[PDB]
């Protein structure tokens, strides 16, 4: 089973947040600011969930993907425009299913841990494959540029779940693609999916290089 938490929800217009990342979320909507205030009132805990359609201004629960993350609001400060900049530390995958009627989005959702890697030796091999593929991916990417610290961090990650999520964070993949990664709670399947996307992209980059 999984812990079930009742938290406010921030709907993300066109981004997917992965666990093991700390990122700024700029929110302009009143209901989103309300959700942040409510999360501050109860240990900073919040759910973040991508919208299916970035154009929806006041999403119903149904307008949001099922999978998101449970996070901690580490900081929230106003920018010069009304904008609230929220620093979110994403901690865990969440299946955010059961919403509560009210003046902002609030839901009960199941939060997932990682469990011990099951086939440990297979997972260790996939970790090595992922690190090698990621180095090539960044080296051959025509738009994405990581500094030495970001690359070092991926190479130096020994936690397979953190590795896969960090790669997925950096990679230029669509909302749908990152949602597919979020929903893979099985570690081996998640590692293989991320490896698969990297490998496909490496082949695509070679094709784009030829045709240009």
Residue numbers in the entry: -1 to 210
Task: Quote the passages of the study that discuss this structure, keeping the authors' original sentences.
The Lon AAA+ protease (LonA) is a ubiquitous ATP-dependent proteolytic machine, which selectively degrades damaged proteins or native proteins carrying exposed motifs (degrons). LonA belongs to the AAA+ (ATPases associated with various cellular activities) superfamily and contains an N-terminal domain (NTD), a middle ATPase domain with conserved Walker motifs for ATP hydrolysis, and a C-terminal protease domain (CTD) with a serine-lysine catalytic dyad in the active site. Substrate recognition of LonA is thought to be mediated by its NTD. Collectively, our results showed that the NTD of LonA selectively interacts with protein substrates via critical hydrophobic residues of its N-lobe, demonstrating that the NTD enables LonA to perform protein quality control by selectively interacting with proteins in damaged or unfolded states.
Based on the result, we also crystallized and solved the structure of the longer N-terminal fragment NN291. The structure of NN291, refined to 1.7 Å resolution, is very similar to that of NN206 except for a longer C-terminal helix by four more residues, that is, residues 207–210. Despite the lack of spontaneous proteolytic fragmentation in the crystals, no electron density was seen past residue A210. (D) The refined 2Fo-Fc electron density map around the C-terminal residue A210 of NN291, contoured at 1.0 σ. Nonetheless, NN243 exhibited extra intense and poorly dispersed cross-peaks around 7.5–8.5 ppm along the proton dimension that is indicative of a highly disordered peptide segment, which most likely corresponds to the C-terminal extension of NN243. Together, our crystallographic and NMR analyses suggest that the NTD of MtaLonA forms a bilobal globular structure (residues 1–206) followed by a C-terminal flexible extension (residues 211–243). Our crystallographic results of NN206 and NN291 are consistent with previous findings that the ~40 residue region between the NTD and ATPase–Protease domains is structurally flexible with multiple accessible protease sites. We further applied multidimensional heteronuclear NMR experiments to assign the observed cross-peaks in 1H–15N TROSY-HSQC spectrum of NN206 (BMRB code: 50697) and the NMR-derived secondary structure of NN206, based on the Chemical Shift Index, was highly similar to its solved X-ray structures. Together, these results suggested that in a MtaLonA complex, each of the six NTDs may connect to the hexameric core by a flexible ~40-residue linker.
